[PDB]
Amino acid sequence: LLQKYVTWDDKSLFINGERIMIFSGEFHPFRLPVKELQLDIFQKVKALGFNCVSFYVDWALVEGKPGEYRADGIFDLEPFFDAASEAGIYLLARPGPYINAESSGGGFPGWLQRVNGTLRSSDKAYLDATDNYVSHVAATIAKYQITNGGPIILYQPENEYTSGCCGVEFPDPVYMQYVEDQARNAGVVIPLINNDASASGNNAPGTGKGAVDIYGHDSYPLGFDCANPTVWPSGDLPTNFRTLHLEQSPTTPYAIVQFQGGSYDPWGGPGFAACSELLNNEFERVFYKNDFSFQIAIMNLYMIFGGTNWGNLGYPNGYTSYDYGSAVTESRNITREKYSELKLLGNFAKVSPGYLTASPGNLTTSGYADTTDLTVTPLLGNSTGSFFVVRHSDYSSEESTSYKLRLPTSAGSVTIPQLGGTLTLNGRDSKIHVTDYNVSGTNIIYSTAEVFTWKKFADGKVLVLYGGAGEHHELAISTKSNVTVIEGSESGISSKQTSSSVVVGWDVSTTRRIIQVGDLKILLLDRNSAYNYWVPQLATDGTSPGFSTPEKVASSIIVKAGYLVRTAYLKGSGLYLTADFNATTSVEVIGVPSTAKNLFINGDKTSHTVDKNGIWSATVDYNAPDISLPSLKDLDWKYVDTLPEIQSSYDDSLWPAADLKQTKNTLRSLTTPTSLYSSDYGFHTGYLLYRGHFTATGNESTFAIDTQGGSAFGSSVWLNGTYLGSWTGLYANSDYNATYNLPQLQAGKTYVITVVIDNMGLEENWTVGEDLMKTPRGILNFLLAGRPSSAISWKLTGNLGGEDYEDKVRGPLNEGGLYAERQGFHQPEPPSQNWKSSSPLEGLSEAGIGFYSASFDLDLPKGWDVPLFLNIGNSTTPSPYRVQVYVNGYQYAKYISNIGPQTSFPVPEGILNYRGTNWLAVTLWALDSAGGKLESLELSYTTPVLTALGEVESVDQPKYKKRKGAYH
C-alpha cells in the first residue's frame, strides 16, 4: 500500500517479492535490559528456524515524567533493533500505547490516573496524553523499518481492542483511525496488523474507518490452570479458525499475533515450572501443528522468552518472575524439551514454500485415514505438494492408534504403507505427512515421517526425516535410481523399485540410518536424535547469518551438536561455527563446502575427521572451572533502620502534604476529606508511606482504615512508636478494612499515625470504558472513632520526587518510598561505614523495616555462561515478612514470606559484575510484633555453559550520592 518491501495476498506475506511464512516469538526488551543478552535470545530464536520477533514497548518506563520521553541507556530500543538485524530476525513492533503484558498499568504510566477522560477512547484528554509518547517511539521505529534497511516489517497499533463497556460506543472507528494515523504521521509506512483478543473481526479490512491492513487475532486455547498440567479439557482445541478467517478477512494472510506459548502465574500460584509442564512439547506438537492445519501464515508465540519483572515493572497480580513457562527460560537456558520440539516445526516451515500455496480443506474423520479415531486436515496443492495434519479426533487422547492412509499424489492415489505393516500415532502427538514434496527438483512422492529440513549442496541433496519411538514409516521418491543403506544396519529397512519410483519402509530406531537414492541422501532419525540437529545459515559475505531470505535459507548447513548452534560462516579454507555446550559434545557437519579444509569452533581450530559419507566429525571438550561463589551470610552486613518515621524525634516538615480537596481520578470519588490516592501526588510505585497528624482529646478508642495496594499487598500501622498491627496480605485481597485499638492518649498532645502500604503495581485496563487502570493506591477510608475525619492532617511519600524521579538511569519504577530508598542507599557504595553490624539472618525483634547492605566480589571465568540465583529459604512456615533485594541499585527480587511462591531469583550478568564488586541491598519488613528474620540467604548457580557469547558489559550502575531534595 505505502511501500513495496512488505506486501501480501490471501495466502502470505511477501518480503522483497518472495513468499515467507512468518514464525515469531514474543520478547520484551524492558524485561531483560542487558544489550548482549538481548543478542543471546535473538540468536536462540533464529536457531529454532524462526525469522521474526514481536515486542512491546512499556510507556510507563520511558515517560515516567509527563512531557519527558526517555528511552536511553537500558531502555534504548536501538541496540535491541541492531541485535535483531545482526541475528537475522525481523521484528513486529507493538508500542501500544496500551500493551497489557502483565505489566503495571498495562503499560500506562501512573499519571494517567489524573487524565479527565476514558482511557483507550477518542476523548481528547486521553489522546493528547498519548501524543508525545507515540511521536517519539514511532519515529524511532520508523528509522528501523525494512524500508530504511532495518529489521522492522510490521507494526501493531493498540492491543486487543476487543471489548468495551460503560457507555463507550464500541468499536470506535474514530479511535482506531486516530491511533493508526499517529503511527503514519511519525513516518511508519510498513503494514499495520491488529491482535483481536478473540476471532471477532474487529478493525478487519473492509470495515471502513480504523481498519488495519492485516487482520490478526490472539488465542490461548489451553488456558492458565498450571496446577493441573496434564488436564487437556474437552473441546479446547480450536477447529473453526479457518472458517472464521474466511468470514472475517479472506483477502489477508491468516494471522495469530499472540498464540499461547506459556502462562502467567499469580502471587500464591503453583509456579512457572508447572506452567512449562502444561505448555510443554506435547502441547506444542498438537496445538501448533493444528494452527498449520488452518494454513497460518503469521504466527507469533507469546512468550518465547519472558524474562523478569524487575524494578516493580509488573502488574499487581504477578510476582518478580515472568519465566512464563516459555521455550527459553527466565535464566536464558534452552534445556526444556519444548524448545527442541519447537525447533523441529520451525525448521520444517522454513524450507517448505509449498505449504503457503496449498489449498486448505476441512478436517475429516474419513477419506484419508482408515479410522474415525483420527482426524486428518488436508492442504492440497496442484503439483506444489500437499500436507496432511493427522491427530486424534479426541485431541486429548493418550491412546496408541494404528492406521493406514489414502493420499492423492502425482503418481496416483496410494494406500500407505504399500510394503506391509501400519503407521502409528502415539498419544498426544500430531504428524504433518507430505506428498509431492520438492527437494530442489527431486520429488518426494510421499513421506509419512516428518521433514526436519533439506538442503542442496555442491555434492548432492540431503533430507532429514524423523519419527517417534516404535513407529513404522514409509516414503517414496520419483527416480530411476536404486536405494542403498550407506550408514547403519540393512535390517528393518524394506524397499521396492518400480519403473519411475522407489518405495522404502523403515522402523524408527535410536541408531541413525542414512539411505542414498541417486543424488539424494536421506537421514532416518528418531525424534530425540533430531532434537540435537541445527540448521544455521552459512554466511559467505561476513560473520552474520542475515535475514531468512530464499537465497540465505538455501545457503545453510546441517549440524549435529548438543546444547546450541548459533551461527556458521565460511572464510577462505575455514568453516567457522559459533556454538554453546553444556557437556562434552560430538559435532557432525553435513554439507561442508568443498573449499573448506579446516574446522573452527568459537575461534579455536578443532581437529576433525571425514567419514565415508563426507560427514566431518569433531569433539568439543567441556571442562568447567571452579565456580566459587561467596557465602552471603558471612558478608560484612551493615544495618540501618529504614523506618525512622516511628521515632518520636522524626521531622516530616519536608514531606508532601496530602491536602488535595478534589481528586483528579475519574473512577473513584473521594470518601475522605482529602485525596489519599498516591497517584494524585505523583507516586505510582513501590512502598508508600502516609503520616496522619492529630491532637488527642483523650477519648480516642479505635482507628479504622481502608488501605489499597493491589492483590497480595500488605500494610502496617503505628501510632507514634506503638505498633498497632498489620494486614499481612492475601492474593484474594486488593484492599483491606482494618480496625486498630489505640492506647490511652494524652489530651492536647499531638500524635502521628504512620501507615506503610505495599503498592503491588497499577492495574491493567483490558475492557475499554471500565478505566480499571485508574484503581487508586493508598488510603480509601478511615475513621478516628468519635472524631470528625478532618481531625487527621495527612502527609505522604512514595519514591523521592514522584514523577520528578531521581534515578534516570534505572527508571521511574525501580525505587519506592522507604527512607533508605529515598536517600539512595540501595545504590553501590552506600555511606554504611558508621552503621551497625547486623545481618538480615539476625533480622528484627519488633515490627519495623530494616535495611541491610553488603558487597561481595565475583571472579567467574571468561567464556562461560553461568546462571546465578538469589535464594531466600522457606523450609518451614514463616512469620509474615516482606523483602526487596537491590543488585547494584536494580531491584531484582520482591518476596512475601506468607504468600509466595518464589524463593529463587535469577539475576543476569550485566546487572551482576562477574569479574568485579557487587552490592546487595535488602529491605526486611516484619509485619509481626515479634519482628522477623530471613531463614537463609544464598547465591547459587546452575549448569555452566561453554558459550560463544562475547563479553557481557556491565550496565550503568550509578553509585550512591547525597540527594539534595531528600527529606532528612
Ligand X SMILES: *[C@@H]1O[C@H](CO)[C@@H](O[C@@H]2O[C@H](CO)[C@@H](O[C@@H]3O[C@H](CO)[C@@H](O)[C@H](O[C@H]4O[C@H](CO)[C@@H](O)[C@H](O)[C@@H]4O[C@H]4O[C@H](CO)[C@@H](O)[C@H](O)[C@@H]4O[C@H]4O[C@H](CO)[C@@H](O)[C@H](O)[C@@H]4O)[C@@H]3O)[C@H](O)[C@H]2NC(C)=O)[C@H](O)[C@H]1NC(C)=O
Ligand Y SMILES: *[C@@H]1O[C@H](CO)[C@@H](O[C@@H]2O[C@H](CO)[C@@H](O[C@@H]3O[C@H](CO[C@H]4O[C@H](CO)[C@@H](O)[C@H](O[C@H]5O[C@H](CO)[C@@H](O)[C@H](O)[C@@H]5O)[C@@H]4O)[C@@H](O)[C@H](O[C@H]4O[C@H](CO)[C@@H](O)[C@H](O)[C@@H]4O[C@H]4O[C@H](CO)[C@@H](O)[C@H](O)[C@@H]4O[C@H]4O[C@H](CO)[C@@H](O)[C@H](O)[C@@H]4O)[C@@H]3O)[C@H](O)[C@H]2NC(C)=O)[C@H](O)[C@H]1NC(C)=O
Ligand Z SMILES: OC[C@H]1O[C@@H](OC[C@H]2O[C@@H](O[C@H]3[C@H](O)[C@@H](O)[C@@H](O)O[C@@H]3CO)[C@H](O)[C@@H](O)[C@H]2O)[C@H](O)[C@@H](O)[C@H]1O
Ligand U SMILES: *[C@@H]1O[C@H](CO)[C@@H](O[C@@H]2O[C@H](CO)[C@@H](O[C@@H]3O[C@H](CO[C@H]4O[C@H](CO[C@H]5O[C@H](CO)[C@@H](O)[C@H](O)[C@@H]5O[C@H]5O[C@H](CO)[C@@H](O)[C@H](O)[C@@H]5O)[C@@H](O)[C@H](O[C@H]5O[C@H](CO)[C@@H](O)[C@H](O)[C@@H]5O)[C@@H]4O)[C@@H](O)[C@H](O[C@H]4O[C@H](CO)[C@@H](O)[C@H](O)[C@@H]4O[C@H]4O[C@H](CO)[C@@H](O)[C@H](O)[C@@H]4O[C@H]4O[C@H](CO)[C@@H](O)[C@H](O)[C@@H]4O)[C@@H]3O)[C@H](O)[C@H]2NC(C)=O)[C@H](O)[C@H]1NC(C)=O
Ligand V SMILES: *[C@@H]1O[C@H](CO)[C@@H](O)[C@H](O)[C@H]1NC(C)=O
Binding site for ligand X (CB under 6 A): 266-269, 730-732, 874, 877-878, 897-903
User: How far apart are CB 954 and ligand Y at their closest, in Å?
Assistant: 21
Cα–Cα distance for residue pair 855/635, rounded to 1 Å: 7
Please give the backbone phi and psi of residue 284, each rounded to the nearest 5 degrees, phi first: -60, -50
Which whole-number Å values give the CA distances from 907 to 330, 770, 841, 866, 899, in the listed order?
A: 9, 37, 21, 11, 22
Contact call for residues 348 and 49 (beta carbons, < 8 A): yes
Which of Cl ion, ligand Y, ligand U, none sits in contact with 357, Cβ below 5 to 8 A by type?
none
**Binders of ligand U: how many residues, by CB under 6 A?**
20
CA 347, CA 333: separation in Å to the nearest integer? 20
> Does 259 sit near ligand Z (CB under 6 A)?
no
Q: Is residue 598 near ligand U by the rule CB under 6 A?
A: no
Q: What is the 3-state secondary structure (H, E, C) of 83-106?
A: HHHHHCCEEEEEEECCCCCCEHHH
Residue 337 in contact with ligand U, rule: CB under 6 A: yes
Contacts of 66 (CB under 8 A, 6+ apart): 109, 111, 129, 132, 803
Q: Shortest gap between Cβ of 44 and ligand U (angstroms)? A: 12
Cβ of residue 49: shortest distance to ligand V, in angstroms? 19
Is 960 a binder of Cl ion (CB under 5 A)?
A: no
323 binds, among Cl ion, ligand Y, ligand U, none (CB under 5 to 8 A by kind): ligand Y
Residue number, 300 or 759, with CB nearest to Cl ion = 759
Spatial CB neighbours of 829, under 8 Å, sequence gap ≥ 6: 919, 959, 960
Q: Judging by beta carbons within 10 Å of its beta carbon (0-12, 13-18, 19+), is residue 76 exposed, middle or buried? A: middle
Residue 770 contacts ligand Z per CB under 6 A: no
CB 60, min distance to ligand V, A: 21
Residue 875 interacts, among ligand V, ligand Y, Cl ion, none and using kind-specific CB cut-offs from 5 to 8 Å, with ligand Y
Q: Name the binder of 728 from ligand X, ligand Z, Cl ion, none, CB < 5-8 A by kind.
A: none
> In angstroms, what is the minimal distance from the CB of 901 to ligand X?
5
Closer Cβ to ligand V, 296 or 313, answer by number: 296
Residue 903: name its binding partner from ligand V, ligand Y, ligand U, none (Cβ under 5 to 8 Å by kind): ligand Y
Instruction: Residue 885: name the closest of 854, 844, 929 by CA.
Output: 854
Q: With contact defined as beta carbons under 8 Å apart, do 13 and 7 qualify?
A: yes
Q: Does 218 bind ligand Z (CB under 6 A)?
A: yes
The two beta strands, 881-887 and 848-859, are unpaired
Q: Candidates 215-223, 278-286, 312-320, 710-718 — which segment interacts with ligand Z by CB under 6 A?
A: 215-223
Q: Which of 12, 38, 54, 100 contacts ligand Z by CB under 6 A?
A: 100
Pick from ligand U, Cl ion, ligand X, none: which does 731 bind, CB < 5 to 8 A by kind?
Answer: ligand X
Q: What is the C-alpha end-to-end distance of the chain, expressed in Å?
A: 60
Residue type, 647: Q
Q: Which of 473, 608, 822, 882 binds Cl ion (CB under 5 A)?
A: 822
What's the DSSP call for residue 49?
A: T
36: enclosing H helix or E strand: helix 35-46
Which residue's CB is nearer to ligand U, number 426 or number 838? Answer: 426
Classify 496 as helix, strand or coil. strand
Binder of residue 822, out of Cl ion, ligand X, ligand Y, none (CB less than 5 to 8 A by kind):
Cl ion
97 binds ligand Z (CB under 6 A): no
State the minimum distance, in angstroms, from the CB of residue 440 to ligand V. 4
Residue 280 or 918: the one with the smaller Cβ distance to ligand U is: 280
Residue 92, C-alpha cell as written in the block? 513486529
Q: Is 160 in the site for ligand Z (CB under 6 A)?
A: yes
Query: What are the DSSP calls for 881-910, one per residue?
Result: EEEEEEETTEEEEEEETTT----EEEE-BT
Instruction: Report the partner that residue 943 touches, choosing among ligand V, ligand U, Cl ion, none (CB closer than 5 to 8 A by kind).
Output: ligand U
- Residue whose beta carbon is closest to ligand U: 280
Q: How far is the CB of 339 from ligand U (least distance, A)?
A: 8
Footprint of ligand U on residues 732-761 (CB under 6 A)? none
770 interacts with, out of ligand V, ligand U, ligand Z, none, CB within 5 to 8 A per kind: none
Site string for ligand U, 481-510 (x = CB under 6 A): -----------------------------x
Cα 854 from chain centre: 32
Nearer to ligand U, 401 or 728 (CB): 401
Judged by beta carbon distances under 5 to 8 A according to partner kind, the member of ligand Y, ligand Z, ligand X, none in contact with residue 266 is ligand X
Per-residue binding letters, 116-155, with ligand U (x by CB under 6 A): ----------------------------------------
Nearer to ligand V, 584 or 702 (CB): 702
Q: Quick one: what does residue 337 bind among ligand Z, ligand U, ligand X, none, with the CB cut-off 5 to 8 Å set by partner type?
A: ligand U
Contact with ligand U (CB under 6 A): which of 86, 180, 213, 282? Answer: 282
Cell triple for residue 880? 509474615
CB 267 → ligand X: shortest distance, Å? 6
Q: What contacts 508, CB < 8 A, 6 or more positions away?
A: 466, 467, 468, 469, 470, 471, 472, 473, 524, 526, 527
Half-sphere exposure of 256 (CA within 13 A, CB side): 28
Return the number of the residue (121 or 281) whose C-beta is nearest ligand U. 281
Reduce the DSSP state of residue 564 to 3 states and report it. strand
Q: Which three cell numbers stand for residue 666?
A: 475519574
Shortest separation between residue 652's beta carbon and ligand V, angstroms:
7
Question: Which DSSP helix (H) or strand (E) runs through 246?
Answer: helix 241-248
- What, of ligand Z, ligand X, Cl ion, none, does residue 877 touch, CB below 5 to 8 Å by kind? ligand X
Judged by beta carbon distances under 5 to 8 A according to partner kind, the member of ligand X, ligand Z, Cl ion, none in contact with residue 197 is ligand Z
The residue behind cell 512488505 is 6
Q: After which residues does the chain have a break in its backbone, defined as C to next N over 2.5 Å?
A: none
- Choosing from 148, 845, 943, 959, the residue that interacts with ligand U (CB under 6 A) is 943
Residues that bind ligand V (CB under 6 A): 116, 243, 362, 383-384, 438, 440-441, 648, 650, 664, 666, 699, 701, 706, 720, 733, 735-737, 746, 749-752, 781
∠617-619-623 over CA atoms, to 5°? 170
Q: Is the peptide bond before 417 cis (omega within 30 degrees of 0)?
A: yes
Q: Which residue is nearest to ligand Z (CB)?
A: 223
**In the complex, minimum distance from the CB of residue 908 to ligand Y, in angstroms, rounded to a whole number:** 10
Binding mask 516-545 for ligand U (x = CB under 6 A): ------------x--xx-------------
With a CB cutoff of 8 Å and minimum separation 6, the contacts of 484 are 515, 516
In the complex with ligand X, the residue whose CB is nearer, 440 or 871, is: 871
Rounded to whole angstroms, how far apart are CA atoms 391 and 385?
20
Task: Count the Cβ atoms, other than its own, within 10 Å of residue 798.
Answer: 31
Report the distance separating Cα 21 and Cα 345, nearest Å. Answer: 12
Angle at 669 between CA 664 and CA 674, to 5 degrees: 70
3-state class of 109 per DSSP? Answer: coil
What's the Cα-to-Cα distance from 270 to each of 274, 316, 679, 907, rounded to whole Å? Answer: 6, 17, 32, 21
Contact flags string 553-572 toward ligand U, x per CB under 6 A? ---------xx---------
Q: How far is the CB of 943 from ligand U (least distance, A)?
A: 4
Residue labelled with grid coordinates 496446577: 227
| 135 Cβ contact list (under 8 Å, min separation 6) | 182, 185, 186
Our CB check for ligand Z shows the closer of 197 and 922 to be 197
Beta bridge partners of 289: none
User: Given the rule CB under 6 A, which residues bind ligand Z?
Assistant: 100, 102, 160, 197-198, 218, 220-221, 223-224, 236, 258, 264
Note the residues at the interface with ligand U (CB under 6 A). 276-277, 280-282, 335-337, 340, 426, 468, 510, 528, 531-532, 562-563, 582-583, 943
